[PDB]
């Protein structure tokens, strides 16, 4: 096996998918080989599609999907209002399971927050992070609320001993703020904080996006993911 | 004693002050005398004063409050920010047990969500749960994201013994839609959803908001509160 992060967030629209893309290309430049994994994707008659977002981004080829549904709504929902079933849990370990190997990094994108239902029945990230022994990345926002709801995320993960391999701010403006700059203090106080993403990475060209991405993280982290 | 509940929510700005007056101008209606406490208000430099809007919407009277900070920030940031320590966690559990009394219902506030500082060091709207046993109501969204939020919540809240009381929606948009509607029947299968306010109604002068507060409450709950 290798390392297995499961990439969840403290809600929807924190940036799990430009995180994503972000640590699997400052990864690759460290020469770590990288596969991403998105096991239920929601939205896809809006055109969401995460995957390809992190192929677009940071050019990871070994993508790997399962689950897709057409409403932008969780997963649960979008799967009755397409007359369509969640992926059970077995589905998604197996997944997880035939992509990691020794000296890859294999990142496992959730949808939503944490304990958005994933497969049958009530099955979560968290509960996949515990099968495939994960630990868990959190994304984060910048913005009010979000001590709070890091907070419950942090203490969720560790009610199932789930590891925290740290927080990213999914998007961070410049210059910052009063209450931005507060809640980025405090985090640390909370967690490691692993980087800070510039608002609309999502946007930066190949090069520039992995010149970001490589500046975004601290090397010696990223490199001691994987042995 | 009589009934302590705090009234707590899955984040900031989800209706946890309309849902106070709510419940509190219900109660009232059910003949319940009521007493809210906000232990710690931010936001007053742009003119946040949520016992102030309580006392306008439901006409209580006993509105007790320890500190109120400038900066509409988290109350800890605030107090950094303004140079002065939050309360102590012994002002506030005895203020909450100093308005509890046989017949009344004491509704206390939290800021924020459930794990925001409120005091020192370092504790939460769901600290002075305990040490008062009180239960807990959550104020939720029904915006894409709250069934999340709301387990985390819940499972905040049992991992204390502290009971949930019950989920109210703060705010219920015209016309509903897909998402609000698809979330408001999965919300009542994570918890007992006891109302769900209309969009708008913190702008309900004091008469309307009694009505539709009579409205969005079940009578037997209520009056079975106390
Ligand atoms: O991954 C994301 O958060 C962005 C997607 C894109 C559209 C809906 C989001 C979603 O997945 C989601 C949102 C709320 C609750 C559960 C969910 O699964
Ligand atoms: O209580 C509310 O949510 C409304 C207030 C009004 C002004 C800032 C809000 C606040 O207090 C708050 C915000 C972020 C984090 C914790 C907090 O306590």
New interface residues.
Partial sequence: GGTILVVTGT???VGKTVVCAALASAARQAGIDVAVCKPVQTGTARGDDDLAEVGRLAGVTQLAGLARYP????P??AAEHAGMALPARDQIVRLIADLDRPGRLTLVEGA?????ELAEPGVTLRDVAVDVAAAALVVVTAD??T???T???L??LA?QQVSCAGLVIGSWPDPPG??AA?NRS?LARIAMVRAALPAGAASLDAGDFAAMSAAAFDRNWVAGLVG
Avoid: D
């Fill in positions: 809600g929807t629209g409403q932008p709504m969780a649960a929902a939503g927050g944490l304990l958005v009010l609320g001590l709070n709801h907070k419950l995320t203490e969720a009610a009063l209450v507060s405090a």
